[PDB]
């Protein structure tokens, strides 16, 4: 029923890796990442969506704090409420808290709903990644082994299920018997494998990868 491997990058549904710099907007990058894939799936056009738009506009009414962190779910709720999000090109990433400058004239995507997946359920995440597209997730990235990761399947014995960094699952597979989640980060191309990390899959919700997954959909 489900494929052994998926890689949404090969379906033209994933934009280039971005670089959040010293602004804690991983939540914003994870959210736009997931919506970018739905925009391509539904319109055939792959366009980077404005993470800055989320940082400036999906703020304290959404429980978010811009460069001091936030949630992908309430980012999606902002896009829903706002009836749009601007393209990255029109509303570029400055890695700073700014005044909201959303302009409907440069709306590149919309969002009608989002779905949150049950805590810890990697089978359900697998299904969603296969059948719906890239899923926005949280991970515990506060380990040197994570930010120093280069290649292979990341496993960290002291990883917890308490998430603190937003990323985007763009697929899954296995590498010589070790199953993994294919994860797009927002630490630029010099993080990991050209900006991606393969994280242990079906090993007890490792690094809380399936603790808080969510994905948007477009009407
Ligand atoms: C104040 O709330 C308001 C107010 C108004 C409207 C809506 C809300 C929302 C109500 C509640 N929801 C989500 C729920 O709490 C579920 N959930 N989600 C997460 C969750 C997911 C992804 C990420 C990630 F790493 F990917 F970014 C994260 S990193 C922490 C994000 N922090 C840090 C700084 C302060 C603000 C942002 C956490 C957690 C939980 C529960 C347990 N702890 C972790 C968020 C806010």
Swiss-Prot record:
Transmembrane segments: none
Active site (UniProt): 26, 165, 185
Keyword Nucleus (UniProt): no
Cellular component annotations (GO), alphabetically ordered: collagen-containing extracellular matrix; endolysosome lumen; extracellular region; extracellular space; ficolin-1-rich granule lumen; intracellular membrane-bounded organelle; late endosome; lysosomal lumen
EC number, as in UniProt: 3.4.22.27
Reactions catalysed, as given in the entry: Similar to cathepsin L, but with much less activity on Z-Phe-Arg-|-NHMec, and more activity on the Z-Val-Val-Arg-|-Xaa compound
Name of this chain's protein: Cathepsin S
Organism, as annotated: Homo sapiens (Human)
Gene this protein is translated from: CTSS
Full-length numbering of the shown residues: 114 to 331 of 331
